[PDB]
Amino acid sequence: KLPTNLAYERSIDPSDVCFFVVWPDDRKTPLTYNSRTLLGQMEAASLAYDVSGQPIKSATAEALAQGNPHQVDFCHVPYGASHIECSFSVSFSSELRQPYKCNSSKVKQTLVQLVELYETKIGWTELATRYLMNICNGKWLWKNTRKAYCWNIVLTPWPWNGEKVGFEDIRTNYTSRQDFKNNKNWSAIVEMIKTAFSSTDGLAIFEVRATLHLPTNAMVRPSQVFTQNSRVFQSTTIDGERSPILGAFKTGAAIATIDDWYPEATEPLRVGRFGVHREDVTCYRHPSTGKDFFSILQQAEHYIEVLAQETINDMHFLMANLIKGGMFQ
Amino acid sequence: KLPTNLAYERSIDPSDVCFFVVWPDDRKTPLTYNSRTLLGQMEAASLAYDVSGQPIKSATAEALAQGNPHQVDFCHVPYGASHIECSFSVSFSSELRQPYKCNSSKVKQTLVQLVELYETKIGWTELATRYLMNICNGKWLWKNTRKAYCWNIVLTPWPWNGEKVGFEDIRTNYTSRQDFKNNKNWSAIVEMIKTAFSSTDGLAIFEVRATLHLPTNAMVRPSQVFTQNSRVFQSTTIDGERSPILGAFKTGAAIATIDDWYPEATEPLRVGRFGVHREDVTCYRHPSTGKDFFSILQQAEHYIEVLSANKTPAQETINDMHFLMANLIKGGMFQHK
Amino acid sequence: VIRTQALGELPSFLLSSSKIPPYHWSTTINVTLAPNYLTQISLPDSDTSYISLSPVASLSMQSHFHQRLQDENRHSAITRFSGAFRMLKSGAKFSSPNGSFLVLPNIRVCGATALSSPVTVGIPSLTAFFGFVHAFERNINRTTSSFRVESFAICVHQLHVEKRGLTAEFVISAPATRDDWQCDVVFSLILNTNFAQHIDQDTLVTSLPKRLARGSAKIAIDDFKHINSFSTLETAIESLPIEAGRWLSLYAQSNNNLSDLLAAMTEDHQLMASCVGYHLLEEPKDKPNSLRGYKHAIAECIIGLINSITFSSETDPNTIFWSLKNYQNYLVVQPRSIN
Fold first, then answer.
1. Minimal Cα distance from A283: which residue of B?
2. Which residues, at least 6 apart from C22, have a Cβ–Cβ distance to it below 8 Å?
3. Cβ separation A226–C160 shorter than 8 A
4. DSSP of C309-335, one letter per residue?
5. Which residue among B168, B198, C86, C164 is least crowded, i.e. fewest CB within 10 A of its CB?
């Protein structure tokens, strides 16, 4: 049923997170990381249990006491600093309404009718709220939120005609959907995102800046490069000084991890073709069970006719995948 | 038995120790060191002895009296200072409850059930006490405590309300766990650690601040870089000037030096997979003894059974479980290539 | 399978397979497009039409580069695929020394591929720059059909290229890994347009494309007020809020051989080389499955040399404004000072 060639351009395009340290004298400087060499212990299983279930003879007791050097990149809050400010810019657009590429008028018309009918019937409110939840509670900061005193987030939307919205002390308050809804501008921003999604060629830009409070000389955990160096950070030049960066695709996956509709759901994974989970690695929505994206997309004609809770769950998953885009061929 | 992709995340995040020197005016300035060179003597065994015999051909009497230069970095308390102040921070993040990465759902479930059963049968009191005593007794200062008049540790916990926990004259006041428990806030700070450990979102951040009353012109020994110099100190830029530090990993090794549940059982060691004793260049928990981390982890089902069967587990199994939970708290990579 | 060699000759200051002996292989053209995953792009072959082409790397040049670049660690970059192909690093580092002119100052793109040409790494391809400009033209054309940009100039503010990696989506597990450099260039550009009147900034910023060389080019919100149209570039240059940067020009001197390329590189180690145009290996022909039903032709990337020009008095704009000349044998964007 799938056409020979089709693809989508992503509708949500986030920037990268830059780490800035703010001194008590209110000056702001880029964060700097330096390589650090450490002496570890021989602790891997393969150095003493190379043969399955038996000790290796050449690894005597004395040979397991020598240290093996390791080199890692080190980043931490400088002493005397007040807080760390992390800023990026997410953009919400409407490329999901028109497929970027397609070779079948039938699939083109079915997809556009399906997205239009989903917007008309189910509405963008659920997806908009789910996307805004991740940005608002600091999900894009990953492990930096953990082991932090108190962090607050301030957003400055582009088509805004008032003050800059803020979320103070997300650790205690703003920990639920109702708590997020109680904010003054929450409905305004949700309607902003809905208008951007619905109106053709619309744009919604949010400039986010999260102030992070950490203990003295606390640790910072930016992204790492995919390619004796055991840990190398991604970095960009800011003002001439190198600074660790959280990545663009990492942020995009962080603000898109909303998939809580998979069978026997326990935690939201990152939205995608299959329910790929990093922690506890497995393949949720495996094509064997028929809950993967391809099988769901194969029922586009049937689903437009019916349009319980499984149907709206399938629509939510389908449109979340369509938002990200990809070579669906 | 061991999964091919098992991995555990660290539960304690120590931090670099910043060395500060305070004057009688209560003004604080960063500590600085200098790379001063020195002249030694030709005293190494290689210079005057071979693997067998002696090198009479070239190691004559006159050639052994020449001075060989050396370059070291010297860090010492300046004259007129009152004392040295050191401060850092730890965090008990409760990351041991679930594996960071796992491939087999059976092993992940077994480990989670083991953690829950341990939490139920055996309180976190033992691990919390052994992990907090090292913080409070000044173990993280390493050799700086030696040859010092008296050192006091003041730490402010989080979340906290009311007093500020402080230990004074650790050398003579707090010399044992019984002395530590006599403090009125000990049962409060210890309970904070175990409460954090026994919850899915637990957290407990401590900010320590120790003062050292070293003698006049005494030398302070920070950590050294791995890497001409025979000794180069690690340093960080404090207030725009260089300052030696102890290092996060070195302080992490000091806090987690609680492993005394081994067959010899004389002095604690850093909690490791094989129990490496650096001062003896040997491991007292090497695999052939049947007590290493993997040999214990492969008996997880038996430990589960012994915890479910009887109210009182055997004392030896209690020590083995304590070692297992200490290794889980430390975290690491347990997979096999 | 493609075997046809270069059809046509190029100028001395442009690089292609015609300038080197191509007998390092391992004349028929017969390829498929509908199921194949090969790249495909569209450029204007005329004032009212476009041309589709699929730039394909020439193994001759890659070998000519791998063999020569050894013992030149100062200007060599290595990459492992799935196998080790060394290329040309761009110096050492990036320092920071008609009417109706429209500016879009301080455009920052995060994660833009630096493997512009198959034999160099550095600044993103000026072909991609021109494609972004023309995409902006297409986006702004829907609200105003009389808007055309005659030429543009590119000013670079911060350039940073380092090794990274792309985490491929699961297809089960992830496919074979690939290593490619990425860049986060911060650049400002000038536009010469025929609108000859003011245009509202809301639609101008609504029509601004975000993607740039597989990146995310976004402009800061507080810089929106700086997006204004001026009648003279002399006062336009004094207006952008950044006092540091460099202007891009072409190196008119000969670069016939790679030995001469490295000789030219070593005097200053500051100029950069990247893709600047495409040399078609086949005349434009129609195939059933094109990008938009236009003529398709397998082409080959051309590596040029980007100069550094500091704008000041007695500095003619004719040396910094680029455009697509649309030659019959090759499609390249070059500064209009060359006749």
1. B103
2. C5, C6, C58, C60
3. no
4. E---TT--GGGT-EEE---SSEEEEEE
5. B168
Could you give the CA distance from residue C222 to residue B137 in angstroms, rounded to a whole number?
Answer: 53
Declared resolution, Å:
3.4
Question: Are A236 and C184 inside 8 Å of each other by CB?
Answer: yes
**CB nearest to C170's CB, from A9, A240, A274:** A274
What are the chain B neighbours of A76 within 8 Å (beta carbons)?
Answer: 15-16, 248
Q: Beta strand pairing status for A18-22 and A101-102? A: unpaired
| Distance to chain A for B294, nearest Cα, Å | 8
Name beta bridge partners: A83: A22
Are A16 and C110 in contact (CB < 8 Å)? Answer: yes
Alpha carbon distance C217, C223 (integer Å) = 14
**Is there a contact between A99 and A5 (Cβ–Cβ < 8 Å)?**
no
Return the exposure string of C15-30: e unless at least 16 CB atoms fall within 10 Å of the residue's CB, then b.
Answer: bbbebbebeeeeeeee
Give, in order, the Cα–Cα distances in Å from B108 to each of B4, B7, B104, B309, C53: 12, 10, 7, 22, 52
Q: How many CB atoms lie within 10 A of CB A321?
A: 22
- 8 A C-beta contact, residue B257 and residue B139: yes
Q: Which residues of C42-62 are buried (b: 16+ CB within 10 A; e: fewer)?
A: bbebeeeebbbbbbbebebbb
Among residues C258, C111, B89, C305, which one has the least CA distance to residue A13? C111
Quote the Cα angle for C147-C152-C154, to 5°: 140
CA–CA separation, A30 and A238 (whole Å): 7
Alpha-carbon dihedral A292, A296, A298, A300, rounded to 10 degrees: -160
A277 to chain B: nearest residue by CA?
A: B101
In whole angstroms, give the CA distance from residue C127 to residue A204. Answer: 29
Residues of C in contact with A237 (CB under 8 A): 158, 160, 184
Spatial separation of the C-alpha atoms in residues C309 and C312, rounded to whole Å: 9
What is the CA A144 to chain-centroid distance, rounded?
A: 13
Reference B261, options B319, B329, B183; nearest CA is B319
**AA letter at A237:** T
Mapped onto helix, strand or coil, the DSSP state of residue A32 is: coil
Is the Cβ pair B276, A64 closer than 8 Å? yes
Q: Please tell me the distance in Å from C18's CA to the nearest CA on chain A.
A: 35
Among B89, B237, B292, select the one facing A215 at the smallest CB separation: B89
User: Taking CB atoms and an 8 Å cutoff, what residues of chain B touch A37?
Assistant: 225-227
Distance separating alpha carbons of residues B17 and B141, to the nearest angstrom: 9
CB A270 within 8 A of CB A256: yes
Nearest chain A residue to B270 by CA: give it. A41
Method of elucidation:
cryo-EM
